[model samples]
Target: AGSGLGRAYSGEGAIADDAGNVSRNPALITMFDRPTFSAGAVYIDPDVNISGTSPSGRSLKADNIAPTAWVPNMHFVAPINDQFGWGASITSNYGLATEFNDTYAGGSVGGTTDLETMNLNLSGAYRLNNAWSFGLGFNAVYARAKIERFAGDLGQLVAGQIMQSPAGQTQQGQALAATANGIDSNTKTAHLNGNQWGFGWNAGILYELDKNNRYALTYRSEVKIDFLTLNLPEMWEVSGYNRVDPQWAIHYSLAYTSWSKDAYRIALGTTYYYDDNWTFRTGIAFDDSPVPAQNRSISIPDQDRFWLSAGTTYAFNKDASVDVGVSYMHGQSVKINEGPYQFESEGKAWLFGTNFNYAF
Candidate 1:
């Protein structure tokens, strides 16, 4: 966060393979006897395309509006006593980047949207007994966003009106026309950007039936940076991991999000201990989008997505190892109707990353 993007996040909240567990479930930190550190980055290549038509029959097309992104993360955990442990994690959980052509027909509604944020989470864990562990966490989130809209069709109409106005006979009309002298469809209409800091909390519980089976539940609160800003949704997740044998295992998770009050995300994955130094994993995930057609916007054409992912971990020695992963994401092609424009949207992406871990 499991070795890399942890096998497409298949195991969700219950996974505890390394120090990265501090980010997924701090309670699992109690399982580590020695201090450990983990760091990694994920590169996202998103290909988004959108085409639309307005009531006046004007056509607008935007190819590859979404750009590439690098998501990075790190975590460190240390045991304090048999009853307590502590950890910290650095990562980003919410963001988006998009840009459209200046001459786009729908520029007035969609031009540029970029949001970036980071989370600094501190966690504490308690081992109540052999089978129960609890976790509590506090986090500060720094968020920033830049959004701009263009005049496009609206400017064209305004300019046309100014050009048709009588003369200085209409003093106000003449002044407006004079100001519109160099106006075009590509003119900038609005722009706004802001950055701020917000706080949130998380809690988790891990239950182990034995070395062969375990389950976990975790909850996170929402973080809103400012009045004119970006925000993350509050959520809950429950997951399980099962060890079938010394070298084989399976895991899965189910989660609920409050974006629309009833969104679901599910994933399943399998792991194989190929040898003393290598472990391989694969999984699939499906996300049920919370934004329906009615609530969708041009800046965020939300849709359901499917993912195919694979990952691997190799141990260099007893105390050091590396984790690598890759994933393919498929976002459905949907239709979006905004104001006087009808839009068709589709997207696809690939994610790849690696992490280095050391234990002491």
Candidate 2:
């Protein structure tokens, strides 16, 4: 129910006996639940993409750009006593990858960017009574990114102008022609490789509304990463007549920029068992992407988004069951400006997943 309907990780409620609830809410890992282990993977196929000529008719398009991604989750809990349980999880909650055609005019401004994260979570939960449970966890996150983009004609012009200038003299037309040639050369691709480790925390509370209904709220703190400084290509440093210092030009224009940001997640979810074998679940979630507008680019168009999900869980036996869920995520249109590159992206995605769980 949690993975399929909630569409969020934190809001899952109890699943099995005492051990069962531990699978849904870590807090339920009590003597009654005993010890349990659960693992599952979700495959997402996205059709929410677009591609077309830009307003300037530059053959601009970003269609079929976002690729399919897989997410895996695992959990294990050990009961300490009647009221306490300890557990751990490895999960992927936030990630994306996109690539534009190299031939598109906008390709010079932005092409491909891939972002992925793996989180190791250690947590403990306590049951205060039959109706209430609480959990707290710490996270160790490993994040990596590969971002590609170009500075476009403006950057070429800046470099060309400095090259042909005779010490304090500017040759306007000559530099303009050189700039055009450099852009046509299409050799200014810049690739930024970055990775970092960050730490965060999560907390959640679960409440039993009745024998058939449960509610949960979870909050995950922000994680921040800083990409290392990037250097331009060697050919980009050369001048027409001589090798002029490229520092000034690099300052005004850049092939790629460093990445930095803070991300936060919050969600609310509920589960209601309608009968002995059928259950219903629903949830709403919010993702606050840390990338700022000025720094946002076409390659990795990050934006704040909202998610709505619904799904069902069917229990066939005491030892096994299956869950299937679907969700729609919406991201507001984002307009970006980086050097000579300008474009707007209205992002959205449809998600579907299934999970099977078994117990001894």
Candidate 3:
């Protein structure tokens, strides 16, 4: 009976946690907090999120650019003995994808960005007694990013000439404009893509108040990533211009020394079993923005966020069950000031997910 409650807690916590939402915190993966007693166990969870926002000042409307995002996760656990248990999981815990119309006024500052992360965790837990359990795990993560920002037409022309590649006819027109009026173009655009890898660790504690009620606390460490080359291509041409210089590519290859910092998180979750077939769960979490305020940019609008969640699990039979949950996220308003672009934005999101549990 006690072990069954622990299993319920594990199942419920997975549904009522941050897995369904989007966030800046890097600690998205955690080890199983309870020991598995079955011959084997497997679970799959998938979700979709929809988000939108508005910006003011110079921007007419930000528009609904939040792309549909899907997050999928898989977990497997097996018991070695009465006191030792081991498990592994693969999931996408940190992700962001958005795109705005090219004609939008905000396009002058930014257009689209996609950032994604994947984590593989291996962990072990020990059950000291009926009332206590502890676990620790190691995590390996891989991350990638891509972004596009508005670069005016004239700026692009001059950039192409600077690169010595002058991509298309836009540069030629810009050159003519410069020669005719002695005025420089204001058009400039940039694109970046790159990936990095890092490592971190997590720990958890599970406490039982009785056979029907249990609570869990988990801590996820910060992961630091360094992106050596973001592949910023030189903007040398417009619709059909050739204004790029070979020497420019050699001098300004569009490489950056940008790096990501460690963002940590603390979460408290509880699960209660009112009867044998149903369970209730709730959780709260605090996530520190991984991107520093000074380092914030138009493409990466990272900020601190708080989360609240609740969910339930229903068993259909002895071998199968389902868990459904929802979460709300809110972030502080952030002001973005970059070269030739400026704006302020506030973000919010709603997340929903479902998990299917089956054992054989």
Candidate 4:
């Protein structure tokens, strides 16, 4: 998973390059000849800006509400024999963290939402033959979320509107206006903190036409916890890999998500064997946003994204190596309409990842 990020995830389901594949398609574990351990982390830095007008006719803006975050993964795969393999993986499936200043103008519409999820997958695979591998995994997922909303500057505007209205025209109205202004900004309006555990199942199929050609399909069941469904999009992805020479290889992927209309992704990547101990990669991809403009929300302002990624791997002898990757996520402008609020969002992100692997 870590290495593939540099290829814009171009060969996700089809590649068995490391133990990381155990998390996505356990069947790939059978491709390994020995016990392997892999560990990695991805850093996500997003710059999201939200600007809009409130129902009270006040302009508000929150710059870079989404903060920096990280995702870490660990995977291990071991072969029991030539035909059987088992593995374990620890990672995250879905999560988010965003916070708007308490005095932000759009605090009422865009506040703070933090969520984290962890998945532990225990998997087993059987090599049906030289051409096929089948696998299954049991998943244990733990999730936690903290959400908060504040009155912010909106309180003062709303108060002013009420104080100057017909209701504020009377003796009681003046007093009500005075009280409304006293409510102040940055007042907490709502909050929630909760955690839960869920269980799910996953399966995969890997078909190798040859050492140089392959195909894969995988699925993970949806797990529900209280109000959150970890997998909302029943997405499908197809990928292929081919080696043309001793030093060059090509891979491609196409994916579609059923949760949103016309939402899909296409990616292509290439790898170069620089030398006996070095490998290099680069890729490009495009992703369609699930949410359309009129239906977008401030909390999850979605947009089409373009990615350019690059990475390299260096091997020390034949058993250990480190891989690193970086990518830029250039997102399209987004418009959000939340009830009486009108807002626009624009942002981009950078991802940096590195992994260490060793074979025993």
Q: Is candidate 3 or candidate 4 better by lDDT?
A: 4
Worst 10 residues of 4 by lDDT: 227-236
The candidate, 1 or 3, that scores higher on TM-score is 1
Which model scores highest in TM-score? 4
In model 1, which runs have C-alpha deviations exceeding 4 angstroms? 2-6, 156-183, 227-229
Candidate 1 residue pairs that clash: 2-6
Q: All candidates' TM-scores? A: 0.91, 0.69, 0.59, 0.92
lDDT of 4 at 6: 85
Any runs in candidate 2 off by more than 4 Å, and if so which? 1-32, 47-57, 128-134, 152-176, 184-188, 194-196, 204-272, 283-295, 303-306
The C-alpha lDDT values of all candidates are 0.82, 0.57, 0.47, 0.81
For each candidate, how many residue pairs have backbone atoms clashing (under 3 Å)?
Answer: 1, 6, 27, 0
RMSD after Cα superposition, model 1? 3.3
* Per-residue C-alpha lDDT of model 1 across residues 47-68, encoded as one tens digit per residue: 9898867654567678999989
Candidate structures ordered by lDDT, highest first: 1, 4, 2, 3
The Cα error of candidate 3 at residue 150, in Å, is 4.1
Error of 2 at 281 (Å): 3.0
lDDT tens digits, residue span 134-158, model 3: 6677777788887776532334334
Candidate 2 lDDT, 1-360, residue by residue in tens? 234344343233433321323433454453245456666666666533434444334545566678887777776677778778788878765576877665556656666777788878888878888777788778777888887765334444555555566632545755554655456424548788778876777665666544433455444555665676321111111000111122110001011122234555455555556665776666677766667778776666567887787767788876667777778778877767754556667777777777666665
